[PDB]
Design a protein around this ligand. Structure first.
Ligand code: 7H9
Ligand code: NA
Ligand code: ZN
Length: 105
């Protein structure tokens, strides 16, 4: 187990570009859209639907069609500086509140 990168510097600069990320997927059979994933800073590992964020290093799996890449990114890797850059702290807050509230019900 590795800690999430919370610095302003990407953990995997090889995957810093959208096109670089998109190449990793190949033919992608999974319920969640590869371009959507690549935009949320994810690249494929080639092991089921395992993705890793290029910046935080944060890893996700088992994508249900209801699950959103940016939402999941914020859920599991709230300290990601890439996430904060693209989405903003107001978005991130909303998502946390929504998830933390989802539990109540
Ligand atoms: C998209 C969504 C993700 N979600 C959480 C998830 O995928 N997380 C949460 C956690 C941070 C605990 C975690 N740690 C390891 C892996 C594995 C991994 C993947 C990529 C990789 F590069 C290296 C390792 C995944 C993972 C799914 C539900 N998860 C499925 C897994 O078991 C925990 C459960 C709650 C539902 N779908
Ligand atoms: Na592939
Ligand atoms: Zn990240």
């Amino acid at each position: 187990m590795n800690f999430p990168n919370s610095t302003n510097l990407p953990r995997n600069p090889s995957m810093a570009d959208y096109e670089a990320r998109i190449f990793t997927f190949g033919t992608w059979i999974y319920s969640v859209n590869k371009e959507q994933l690549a935009r949320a800073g994810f690249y494929a590992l080639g092991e089921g639907d395992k993705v890793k964020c290029f910046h935080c290093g944060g890893g996700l799996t088992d994508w249900k069609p209801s699950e959103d890449p940016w939402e999941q990114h914020a859920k599991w890797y709230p300290g990601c500086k890439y996430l904060l850059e693209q989405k903003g702290q107001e978005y991130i807050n909303n998502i946390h509140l929504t998830h933390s509230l989802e539990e109540c019900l």
